[PDB]
Amino acid sequence: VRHIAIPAHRGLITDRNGEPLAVSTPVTTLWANPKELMTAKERWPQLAAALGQDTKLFADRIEQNAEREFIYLVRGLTPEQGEGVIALKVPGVYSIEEFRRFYPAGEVVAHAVGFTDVDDRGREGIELAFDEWLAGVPGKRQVLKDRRGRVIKDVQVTKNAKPGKTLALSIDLRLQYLAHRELRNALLENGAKAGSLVIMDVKTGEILAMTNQPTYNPNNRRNLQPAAMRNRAMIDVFEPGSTVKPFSMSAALASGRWKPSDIVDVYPGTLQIGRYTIRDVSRNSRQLDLTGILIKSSNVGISKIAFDIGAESIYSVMQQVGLGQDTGLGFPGERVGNLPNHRKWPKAETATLAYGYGLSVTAIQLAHAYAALANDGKSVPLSMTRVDRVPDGVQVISPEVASTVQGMLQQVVEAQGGVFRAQVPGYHAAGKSGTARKVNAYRSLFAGFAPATDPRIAMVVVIDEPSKAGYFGGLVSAPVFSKVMAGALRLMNVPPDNL
Ligand SMILES: *C(=O)[C@H](CN1CC(C(=O)NCCN2C(=O)c3cc(O)c(O)cc3C2=O)=C(C(=O)O)N1)NC(=O)/C(=N\OC(C)(C)C(=O)O)c1csc(N)n1
Numbered sequence: 461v462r463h464i465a466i467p468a469h470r471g472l473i474t475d476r477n478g479e480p481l482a483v484s485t486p487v488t489t490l491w492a493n494p495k496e497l498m499t500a501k502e503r504w505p506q507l508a509a510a511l512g513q514d515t516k517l518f519a520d521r522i523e524q525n526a527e528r529e530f531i532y533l534v535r536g537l538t539p540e541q542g543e544g545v546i547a548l549k550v551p552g553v554y555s556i557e558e559f560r561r562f563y564p565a566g567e568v569v570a571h572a573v574g575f576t577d578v579d580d581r582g583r584e585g586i587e588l589a590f591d592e593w594l595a596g597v598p599g600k601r602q603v604l605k606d607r608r609g610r611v612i613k614d615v616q617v618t619k620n621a622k623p624g625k626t627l628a629l630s631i632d633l634r635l636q637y638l639a640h641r642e643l644r645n646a647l648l649e650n651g652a653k654a655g656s657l658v659i660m661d662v663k664t665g666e667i668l669a670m671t672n673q674p675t676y677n678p679n680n681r682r683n684l685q686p687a688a689m690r691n692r693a694m695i696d697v698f699e700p701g702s703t704v705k706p707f708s709m710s711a712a713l714a715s716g717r718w719k720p721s722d723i724v725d726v727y728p729g730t731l732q733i734g735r736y737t738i739r740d741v742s743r744n745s746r747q748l749d750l751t752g753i754l755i756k757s758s759n760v761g762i763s764k765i766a767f768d769i770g771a772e773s774i775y776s777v778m779q780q781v782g783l784g785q786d787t788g789l790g791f792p793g794e795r796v797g798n799l800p801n802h803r804k805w806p807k808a809e810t811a812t813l814a815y816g817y818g819l820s821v822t823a824i825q826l827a828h829a830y831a832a833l834a835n836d837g838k839s840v841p842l843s844m845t846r847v848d849r850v851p852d853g854v855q856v857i858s859p860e861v862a863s864t865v866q867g868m869l870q871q872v873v874e875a876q877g878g879v880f881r882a883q884v885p886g887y888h889a890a891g892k893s894g895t896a897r898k899v900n901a902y903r904s905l906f907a908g909f910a911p912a913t914d915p916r917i918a919m920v921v922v923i924d925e926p927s928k929a930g931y932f933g934g935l936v937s938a939p940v941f942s943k944v945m946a947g948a949l950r951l952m953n954v955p956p957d958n959l
Pocket of ligand 1: 699700701702703741742756757759815816817818893894895896897898932933934
């Protein structure tokens with residue numbers, strides 16, 4: 461008499477609308493008692509054939525395990541294939557009924573959902589993070605064996621298996637599909653190495669979509685590079701560059717010393733700070749109002765504002781909206797990044813902070829920060845699960861500064877010489893481009909939200925090493941935001957505010 465495991469049914473993972481993302485399917489494991497097999501050698505070759513094993517390698521194996529009462533023959537056949545080889549009636553060949561994950565959306569949601577191992581344990585993504593909730597508790601059954609390992613009776617069930625619990629993700633499979641296709645299309649269109657796209661509900665903290673390129677089929681994980689398994693939206697850190705300028709502007713408008721119509725002189729489009737040189741791409745400007753600084757992405761303009769208000773006020777807004785701060789999702793391998801702090805801020809670091817140099821963030825943090833700005837300065841906690849009861853937000857930017865900065869980002873998108881590729885047919889949209897030279901090689905960024913009049917959705921597009929002549933965020937990333945924001949607002953029945 462021994463006690464042996466009854467595997468629990470692993471909980472269904474669904475999208476927010478109940479569409480299956482991870483399903484436990486019944487499969488059959490074959491095992492053999494070698495001590496029984498050793499009395500039916502004439503049966504081995506037929507049994508070897510049936511397992512697609514070679515006659516002599518199979519016989520070498522049984523011989524080598526002749527002292528044992530258990531070995532695995534094969535794991536995870538269908539119930540039909542399993543029943544096919546049990547029907548050969550080979551002494552000492554036995555059937556365990558098991559569960560195996562199937563992922564109906566495959567590579568589309570692989571980074572978020574993750575996978576289980578052959579033992580049905582969660583090892584990546586949601587499968588790992590919610591493993592206790594999904595696995596349930598195994599059962600035990602009492603099994604009498606004769607003295608040479610022959611299973612005879614099933615004496616009783618000692619303890620019943622408790623099933624796993626259903627888990628509904630925040631992901632909307634319809635937005636996930638749209639996000640997946642358009643990031644793939646832009647990646648191919650730009651000969652890009654990698655990229656990420658994140659969509660947030662600005663009101664609920666919910667991640668409606670999270671896709672990366674490259675991806676992999678979790679149903680077929682054989683001969684698979686690590687690179688394609690990385691959930692880059694959460695585990696990759698990058699410099700966000702000029703996409704942080706709206707947080708600098710937030711500190712400027714909250715200081716009491718700046719309003720949108722104020723002028724900064726950026727001539728000649730450079731500014732020497734000790735040994736270091738601050739440089740604009742476009743160097744044909746003198747006076748720029750604060751909206752112009754964002755439209756022309758003048759590093760010199762935001763630097764002079766940063767000198768006047770102090771890095772401390774800028775650091776604080778960036779810390780508050782979650783840049784380089786723990787998200788608290790508890791997701792495997794999640795990076796925090798780095799928001800550098802100083803006891804006393806020097807000049808050079810005051811400027812670089814203000815335009816997103818020497819800062820490290822995730823696509824998720826950047827999306828969360830834009831979510832807070834869109835939701836009138838209120839940060840709602842992030843969830844990867846369906847939110848039925850929305851937790852209270854924290855007011856991180858005053859509602860009036862948030863509303864002024866939204867208006868300015870609406871201008872970045874809609875005004876003359878603005879980022880017109882980010883415009884969303886039938887809607888007012890708002891956002892900020894960025895371009896990071898990595899240490900030539902570029903990262904193209906667009907972060908924004910829509911509709912501008914009552915924000916619903918925040919979105920970040922990161923394309924890593926576009927290899928065509930176009931590398932600027934406004935060229936590469938902005939058109940992706942456009943197509944994916946259009947489809948997302950329509951799938952979510954958001955009334956057009958620009959008709
Ligand atoms: C923030 O991301 C800063 C500043 N960049 C500048 C900029 C940009 O210049 N985009 C617009 C470029 N540009 C046009 O597309 C365009 C089109 C027309 O029709 C006209 O007439 C003019 C122009 C025009 O000037 C960025 C943006 O995408 O918004 N932001 N980035 C940096 O400071 C760093 N990278 O600088 C560059 C990319 C110039 C470089 O090659 O080094 C940076 C920040 S963090 C990091 N690692 N690098």
